[model samples]
Target: IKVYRYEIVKPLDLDWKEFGTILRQLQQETRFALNKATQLAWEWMGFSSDYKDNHLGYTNVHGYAYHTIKTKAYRLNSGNLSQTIKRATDRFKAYQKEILRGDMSIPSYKRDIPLDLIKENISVNRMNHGDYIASLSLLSNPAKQEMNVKRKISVIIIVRGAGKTIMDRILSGEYQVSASQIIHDDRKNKWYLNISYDFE
Candidate 1:
């Protein structure tokens, strides 16, 4: 089960700079959402495991925090929300296992955590001449077709890179995508899809 990872480069198009800007904002919101979930998960286990009975389960932590988290970062869909909760839940779970031993402190989101999208949120193809294109559903509540508020709200970025062979193979499904992350490089002023794939 060897999975290879690559930072698929995304050259910033002038018009697409707006899309990059929105994604950067989203990255921060997702980070905030993650820590908030982590905090909620820990507080749920507050020194009352005796009264709570079962404190060692996932236990609808997502359900308990979903409303607050969504209201603050509602742009993210359920998939990304669940993924965020799971990361937080694992950290607190680790703390419990080690507290009864080591320095398992509460996890905080300081860096840019990749916006992990489910398969439903992403689609890839080589529609044009010798280039790969990927479309992503970034917003949770998309506007109506009539609203025309950034009508094409979903991101559809074209792949521009020297590894055309590998890119084509990825688009063609020879190298299947196991997981993908929408990320940005602050220094480079471009967006990227950090891809993890394995051979067919």
Candidate 2:
């Protein structure tokens, strides 16, 4: 069977400079926002995963889908590099809430931080926030990560796997998902799922 892949591009209204400024603002806030647990989650998300191949633009934040085919059969998964993306995102939101509500406090309000330092923090903070949201998005191959339910079509199939006519015959009329469709090995072998909008 033939294979095809598509990348979803989300457009932003703000210019690159404006976007950088917004990121700087977020950096200024993290000093007061990040807590012990939240900080750990951030650190985890920041850590690189050599098991998953990193894209040039993906950096440490953005999530991506992965699919593989062997002898005309396919298996797929998403966010291979971001195994902890969901939990990290949750921590990010929790940190944001605490900062906004005055629950998470900074060590000191004295001696204001330099703009460069604030900007550096903001850059990482924005990356973390972007990853937090992007990691949650269900655009990846396996779709284990969940996206906000604000869209008309909120949920999509998690995974799909297909072999030959024999496998298709056995899976006919099966709406429920299988285990192999969800989890897959990362360090070595990869197994996710196959998909076709019209069962092609």
Candidate 3:
């Protein structure tokens, strides 16, 4: 898949510190969802099969995790939370390979993971200055004092370096956006939104 990895320059007309606080909550909620859903998947798998190697599909895991997810007031939207729970289910399935070695393992959450943006809620618009601004609505009611501006965060899609060709196709509407995610780099203190599109 072709991907667009661009820096989140800044949240449009937001207090940077407020954004930071929201980010921490987002990160924590993401980690929580991933860990909890994975745990649920693992437990269900362990109980469902005696060999303890059952990898539940998305619907099954979602069946097990949806209520669990709803019990908590996560900042992520329902779609984003579904994506994350499905991610947990998939990763656990991937780890199913570890059992071939002898002993298996459970997944753990350490750092912030790549989070899916709400695909249906996304909009990309071009400015008069040839800049691309994308709206991300993956978070649910994130701001406390957002009475004046947009609830959806607006960020620039920086088309830089070797990624220009990919951006060209994307900007030209020649590519289909598939699964897109946002990642935060703690080392550089930046958030990058990566949109993967079908190249061929």
Best by lDDT: 3
TM-score ranking, high to low: 3, 1, 2
Cα lDDT tens digits, model 1, 75-177, are 6666777667677767766677554345565566767667877656666666546545566656665422322334224333544554455566777768766
Which residue pairs collide, candidate 3? Answer: none
The true-versus-predicted C-alpha distance at residue 94 of model 2, in Å, is: 5.1
Question: After superposing candidate 2, which stretches have Cα over 4 Å from the reference?
Answer: 1-78, 104-173, 176-200
Clashes in each model (backbone N, CA, C under 3 Å)? 0, 6, 0
Model 2, 1-200: lDDT tens digits are 22211111221332444433433442233222222224434334443356543443433321211111111111111221122223334556556546556787522322222111111111100223322011112222322233222321111122123323323332353322211111223363332222221223
Error of 2 at 62 (Å): 4.3
Worst-scoring 10-residue span by lDDT in model 2: 116-125
lDDT of 3: 0.73
CA lDDT of 194 in candidate 1?
A: 63
Colliding residue pairs in candidate 1: none
Choose 1 or 2, whichever is better by lDDT. 1
**Residue 38 of model 3, lDDT score:** 78
After superposition of all CA atoms, the RMSD between model 3 and the true structure is 4.5
Off by over 4 Å in 3: 47-59, 97-102, 141-149
* TM-scores for the candidates: 0.72, 0.19, 0.81
Candidate with better lDDT, 2 vs 3? 3
